[PDB]
Amino acid sequence: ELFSQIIWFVDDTNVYRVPIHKTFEGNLTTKPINGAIFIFNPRTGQLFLKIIHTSVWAGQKRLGQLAKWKTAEEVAALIRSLPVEEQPKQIIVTAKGMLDPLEVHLLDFPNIVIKGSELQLPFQACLKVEKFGDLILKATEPQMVLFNLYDDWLKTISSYTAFSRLILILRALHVNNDRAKVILKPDKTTITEPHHIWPTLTDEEWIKVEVQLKDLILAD
């Protein structure tokens, strides 16, 4: 199932980013900031972060549409740089407009099945995590960076449990950033290792955190 085959979630929601601002003259700004494609392996925790520099948009119209195609191009490029045995067997998109661009970009990979999903998996929230947000903001050229979004969790829990824990974190951060961060710091001495994304907590502390995140998402 979702935990067997190499599977990737692809999120395009942060690729083309135009902050909403009204100029002194009363018009909306149109200038983009750097974005990123998130490509996520839910069994291993592996994240490929492709940073999208604003220079790539210079020139053309209907950039929201074009960004779906850019995302697909970059997914295809990643696949071609990997050995066959590391290539995904399934690609899952939560955005419907990704389906046709991916289908056209992956015609050379007949093994790869592309499907849509109604799952709420908001990588948007990673833009609020400073490790990622700063890296994206400050980039001066495109590049790709590797991450392990499960930290050391798989030493003691299953991929299923880790995936659930991550979705709860991202969803909580997405609906209520400030309260999510409070929940994720239960003690003054709670820290996050420099190479980790998330705090170091005991598995009992995580049970309690996970209930509170669920509650926060339910409260909206």
Side-chain angles (χ1 to χ4, degrees):
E1 276 281 305
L2 196 77
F3 300 97
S4 149
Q5 293 183 2
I6 298 173
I7 296 172
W8 287 351
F9 287 94
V10 172
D11 189 306
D12 80 321
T13 70
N14 315 288
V15 168
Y16 175 66
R17 295 171 78 204
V18 176
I20 284 160
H21 186 55
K22 185 179 279 147
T23 66
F24 296 145
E25 301 78 33
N27 308 114
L28 292 180
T29 48
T30 63
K31 287 169 88 292
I33 60 175
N34 294 337
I37 309 163
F38 294 81
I39 303 173
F40 178 63
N41 182 330
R43 187 179 72 83
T44 65
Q46 169 162 76
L47 174 65
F48 306 86
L49 185 73
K50 291 231 197 174
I51 302 176
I52 301 295
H53 186 256
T54 52
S55 63
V56 81
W57 311 121
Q60 61 283 325
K61 289 268 282 144
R62 294 277 277 109
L63 293 166
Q65 215 294 308
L66 178 62
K68 306 268 175 189
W69 283 98
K70 175 69 181 175
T71 295
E73 176 189 328
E74 292 293 344
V75 173
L78 174 60
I79 293 174
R80 289 194 196 278
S81 72
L82 296 167
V84 167
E85 70 169 55
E86 315 287 353
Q87 299 172 351
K89 163 63 204 188
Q90 293 178 43
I91 292 169
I92 303 182
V93 294
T94 55
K96 292 187 160 57
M98 282 304 307
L99 290 168
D100 296 332
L102 281 165
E103 168 60 25
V104 173
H105 270 282
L106 294 172
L107 289 173
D108 300 330
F109 304 90
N111 244 97
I112 303 170
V113 165
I114 296 151
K115 65 172 74 87
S117 159
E118 301 294 302
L119 199 73
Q120 301 300 293
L121 186 54
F123 291 94
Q124 302 83 290
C126 290
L127 305 175
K128 292 149 176 189
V129 176
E130 223 203 337
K131 182 168 297 203
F132 300 126
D134 262 307
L135 185 61
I136 295 162
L137 193 113
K138 292 178 173 174
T140 56
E141 67 188 7
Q143 56 210 263
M144 188 172 76
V145 183
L146 301 188
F147 294 93
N148 166 22
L149 296 193
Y150 295 164
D151 295 338
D152 297 337
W153 303 343
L154 300 177
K155 290 189 168 168
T156 54
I157 64 171
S158 74
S159 294
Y160 154 78
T161 302
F163 184 59
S164 296
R165 181 183 290 168
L166 179 72
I167 295 165
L168 296 177
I169 290 164
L170 289 182
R171 288 186 77 180
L173 286 163
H174 183 56
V175 307
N176 194 341
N177 182 46
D178 290 330
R179 173 66 176 151
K181 288 163 153 54
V182 170
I183 289 167
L184 286 166
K185 193 168 187 216
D187 198 278
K188 195 193 177 174
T189 61
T190 295
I191 75 295
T192 298
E193 293 298 315
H195 58 280
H196 280 5
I197 311 307
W198 310 117
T200 292
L201 296 177
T202 71
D203 271 329
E204 282 202 350
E205 292 179 298
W206 272 120
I207 288 172
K208 299 174 75 300
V209 161
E210 282 177 50
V211 175
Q212 296 173 80
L213 295 179
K214 180 265 286 161
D215 286 344
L216 179 64
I217 300 153
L218 281 173
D220 205 352

